[PDB]
Amino acid sequence: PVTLEPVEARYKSFSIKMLKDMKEGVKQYGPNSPYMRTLLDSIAHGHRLIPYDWEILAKSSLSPSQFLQFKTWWIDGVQEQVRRNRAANPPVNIDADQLLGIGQNWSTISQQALMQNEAIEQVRAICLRAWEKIQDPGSACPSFNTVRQGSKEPYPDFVARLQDVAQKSIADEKARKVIVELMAYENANPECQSAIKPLKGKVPAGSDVISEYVKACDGIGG
Amino acid sequence: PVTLEPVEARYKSFSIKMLKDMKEGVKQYGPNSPYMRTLLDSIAHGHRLIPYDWEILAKSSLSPSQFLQFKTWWIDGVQEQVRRNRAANPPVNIDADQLLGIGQNWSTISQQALMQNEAIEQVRAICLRAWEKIQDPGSACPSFNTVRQGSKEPYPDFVARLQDVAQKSIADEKARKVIVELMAYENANPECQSAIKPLKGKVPAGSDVISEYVKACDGIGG
Amino acid sequence: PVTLEPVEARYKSFSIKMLKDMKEGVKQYGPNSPYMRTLLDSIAHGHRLIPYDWEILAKSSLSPSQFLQFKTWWIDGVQEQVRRNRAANPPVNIDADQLLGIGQNWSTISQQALMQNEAIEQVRAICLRAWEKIQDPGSACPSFNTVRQGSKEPYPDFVARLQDVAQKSIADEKARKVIVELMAYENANPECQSAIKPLKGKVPAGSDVISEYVKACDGIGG
Amino acid sequence: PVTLEPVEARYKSFSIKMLKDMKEGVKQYGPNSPYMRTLLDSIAHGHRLIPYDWEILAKSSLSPSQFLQFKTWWIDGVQEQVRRNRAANPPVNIDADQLLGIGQNWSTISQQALMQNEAIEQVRAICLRAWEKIQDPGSACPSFNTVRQGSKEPYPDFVARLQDVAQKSIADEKARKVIVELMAYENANPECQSAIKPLKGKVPAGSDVISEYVKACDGIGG
């Protein structure tokens, strides 16, 4: 993080304790567990992070295979970023090397420290979305056709895998909501399909569609 | 239809020819063929139709089984109509019997003829949506899980079944668009899945996502 | 929690440490372990919790599947709450959105902070009962017929499963007590049934019925 | 079509009869039957067609799968059109949205009606070539290697499949003529190959190469 004064910026490492908490989490819970999403966001919003710090936090906390993915989507997400910065009126002078932290203009701590708040919030959204696609260690992201509720499997465990696949694959949240409610009924088992059909497209008041489908299958299982 | 003067309204049957054209179509093409959607809309927007006329056109033109479905969803769609008319400020005084054309206030030709333009446009949207769910004669509406591209089957024939299932099942058009683009890739065969993946989430300019996926699989088949 | 002054209310996050203790527990012991019932109650009674805080604590500490259940029974328990608030004389003006924390009147931190103590104690009893029905991760709640003492299984381990099933299923505690004492004798194995029958319906003094049945089978096992 | 006056342009729908004739044809004969090529050309050359009209005619007359192909090659053919308009001296100011009829400059009937004759003839050649690649409903376009004269099959039926495959695949007509005359001899059956060889590369006067090969095999068959 970059600390300030009151005009100068002083750069100080992360703590030995804080780097230890992040390692224990990703290692046990997972990188995209809801405990770590809350913990990561607590650091990103409560500190000023330059592109040099995002490398330090991620190399320590992640696996070697998981740092390859992170650096990939950080790259792939800056490319679609500049496509939107040049297509805007007025053009914004934020180029690829400033985001990624490479070249000679932006490849030191003293150089990156004097970054504007508007670029800081631009890298923060790319790096937080690059973390959302990091996979679990032996896994590969599955397709919607293969996420099917098996026999003798609880229902809320099935509709939580669906929301996982849709968070990596689909970028828009409003489009995410459309896909999950449909595949919840279609991909389910017969015993649940028995129970949902008298409720489809009808939610009484102050509730979601997903809560009403878990309530209906509540005892079915094995 | 209801013809007028210039203040009085005269009601005249459909023609012998026009009732013959509608019968030939539904019988050969289908009720929801794009030829009949255009032909039906040509009558509904170019004439004034009371609830008594929608019965005459549908009983003649459809099968006995298809008129049971039509009258069902016409009923089911008026119920969610009044739920929205009473929940509005100011309340609208359009009740169930005026839409369906029953009771004693609204069960004759002289009674229904003096309807306001605002109720006419309200029944038109319900009856045109009730026609959209009429099935093909030996068929039942399938689920999204079962619409899968078989081997030796062309690709645009597969993504046209998808848009059929999504027109009956899903009421919102913006939500329809989200479901089809996803299931197009997932439910496809391997040979197409080979071809689409280098194009997913990237469309160059002035095109749809669906046109770019049919172009890619263009020669695959059997 | 909502802290006060002496008339204003200041809202401050949970601690990084406290959110870590709750995660370790649910993850290892379980959400309804007696260690966590004591720990949760220590926070609920020793702080002021708005509906916004109950979301923060539960999303972090629970699984994605377990947060679907929690939000379901929180909804299902507010509906039977208003049924009792309107049926009372005088009517109480506590409606559904104030409990759940939705709408525009009650969907911010500054709005919810000015809640009365009587609504605070009403949401506390619903959210603490919604936590009591959260299942273990691969499990589904069983029926009383299936909770049967197997061969080579200790006796107090069997009558602890009974009290688990009766805590989720049955809402009244006085009715819970009637069901467990009966099914303890009926659902048991023969070797225990041998030992309990000379003691049924007779407890000497200052003891429970359950302690006298575990004492009797004390060495039986395998 | 766009009708005129003598400076203003009035836009009027197609007739109910004319839209009926096009539907009967494509449905029975096929979209690329020689009856429909003559009928379509009769409308395109004898009327003024804007991009809005080409959508109306094609959506009604074609299948849902066949309208996906049409819109694809209309798109793919405008892209190679602008590549030739910018590479020319002087550059022609005809851009992609004017041809396709999208954006806000060219997305209404009043906007498109004031188009110049030179753009009208440019869209006409792209849409007429997009219709030439529409496939038959269960079919996929085959490769030249697979078009082989079977046993017990007439000869002019075989060399008519060849001219079909070469019309979709190959864009240039002078190159089309070279491929068919060669593959006619090579891909044929032995009994015909017996008969053609004393005539190859020799045509007497005022005839084609193809007429002289059908004459030679005239009775062979089964």
Residue numbers in the entry:
A (entry chain A), B (entry chain A), C (entry chain A), D (entry chain A): 1 to 6, 21 to 236
From the paper:
CA forms the capsid shell surrounding the viral core that protects and transports the viral genome and also interacts with host cell factors that are necessary for trafficking, nuclear entry and proviral integration. Further, we assemble particles from HML2 CArec in vitro and use single-particle cryogenic electron microscopy (cryo-EM) to determine the high-resolution structures of four different types of Fullerene shell assemblies. Our studies of HML2 CArec show that an ERV retains the ability to form capsid assemblies using the same architecture as exogenous viruses.
The majority species comprises 12 HML2 CArec pentamers with all interfaces equivalent, obeying perfect T = 1 icosahedral symmetry. The structure is resolved at the highest resolution (2.7 Å), likely corresponding to the 32S species observed in sedimentation experiments. The NTDs of each pentamer are associated proximal to the five-fold axis and form a layer of structure at a radius of 86.3 Å (NTD centroid distance) from the particle centre. Beneath the NTDs, the CTDs form an “inner cage” layer at a radius of 64.7 Å (CTD centroid distance), and more distal to the five-fold axis. The NTD layer does not contribute to inter-pentamer interactions and so the entire inter-pentamer interface is mediated through inner cage CTD–CTD interactions across icosahedral two-fold axes. In HML2, the vertical displacement between the NTD and CTD, as judged by the centre of mass (CoM) of the two layers, is 21.6 Å. This configuration facilitates formation of a specific hydrogen bonding arrangement between CTD residues D171 on α7 and K229 on α10 with S79′ and D90′ on α4 of the neighbouring monomer NTD (′ denoting a neighbouring monomer) and defines the pentamer conformation. By comparison, at the unique type of CTD–CTD interface in the T = 1 particle the α8 centroid displacement is maintained at 12 Å, but the crossing angle is significantly enlarged to 65°.
